[PDB]
């Protein structure tokens, strides 16, 4: 059932994730310092964290089978629209349900709901974001399923501004069929029950999170004093 091409796709995506996600979190020392001790005291650190993660998301995307066959315009449209969603998905690796926080190896780099609020965001975003992290963690995805879901998210044909929607759809369909076949062949029950449908629900959840994050980002970044604390990459990708 899982064809050799489908096994190849999975192998490429696992390798791409290993090359672009560093679970030692060594580079966090390079970011502006978190300040917790109201002002948006965590904005400099979290802007650097987000900017670093965007770079890793682009590096992963470039390795998705078929992504490089798209025009530069379409690659750009797809990364601009999906980067926020892929950041939410990939951060699930460091999320822990012990205290509902993102634990990146040390106390300095352990982030909770208060840290997100100290970058300027409100419960309108943060409450659904925690519910998403919990629901995704509860799916107990195989790493194979986690990397396929990130790839499917990036290569979405309904993103605004997509030109060659039929080619985007053809690439995504190959990934979607790989995931559906992987679940049926390699994920034992009961964990596999309705798993594909539950993963696609997480993609719909991400669209809602994207819409809210974009609304609040627009309000935050409209104030020039906040935009001054962002990075050039964040301004280019999330908007200026």
């Amino acid at each position: 059932k899982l064809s050799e091409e489908q096994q190849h796709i999975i192998a490429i995506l696992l390798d791409a994730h290993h090359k672009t996600y560093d679970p030692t979190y060594a580079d966090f020392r390079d970011f502006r310092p978190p300040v917790r001790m109201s002002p948006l005291s965590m904005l400099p650190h979290l802007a650097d964290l987000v900017s670093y993660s965007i770079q890793k998301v682009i590096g992963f995307a470039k390795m998705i089978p078929g992504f490089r066959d798209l025009t530069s315009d379409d690659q750009i449209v797809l990364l601009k629209s999906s980067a926020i969603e892929v950041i939410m998905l990939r951060s699930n690796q460091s999320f822990t349900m012990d205290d509902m926080s993102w634990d990146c190896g040390s106390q300095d780099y352990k982030y909770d709901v208060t840290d997100v609020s100290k970058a300027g965001h409100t419960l309108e975003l943060i409450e659904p974001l925690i519910k998403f992290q919990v629901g995704l963690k509860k799916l107990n995805l195989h790493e194979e399923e986690h990397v396929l879901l990130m790839a499917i998210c990036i290569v979405s044909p309904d993103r605004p501004g997509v030109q060659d929607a039929k080619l985007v759809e053809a690439i995504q369909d190959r990934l979607s069929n790989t995931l559906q076949t992987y679940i049926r062949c390699r994920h034992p029950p009961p964990g596999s029950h309705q798993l594909y449908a539950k993963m696609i629900q997480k993609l719909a959840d991400l669209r809602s999170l994207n819409e809210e994050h974009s609304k609040q980002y627009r309000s935050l970044s409209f104030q020039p004093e906040n935009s001054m604390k962002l990075t050039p990459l964040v301004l280019e990708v999330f908007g200026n």
């Binding site: 682009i58 590096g59 530069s72 750009i76 990364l79 990459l233 280019e236």
Partner: peptide
């Protein structure tokens, strides 16, 4: 309108 940093990271 131009995305030079993204374009550059995209090769």
């Amino acid at each position: 309108k131009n995305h030079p940093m993204l374009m550059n990271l995209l090769k």
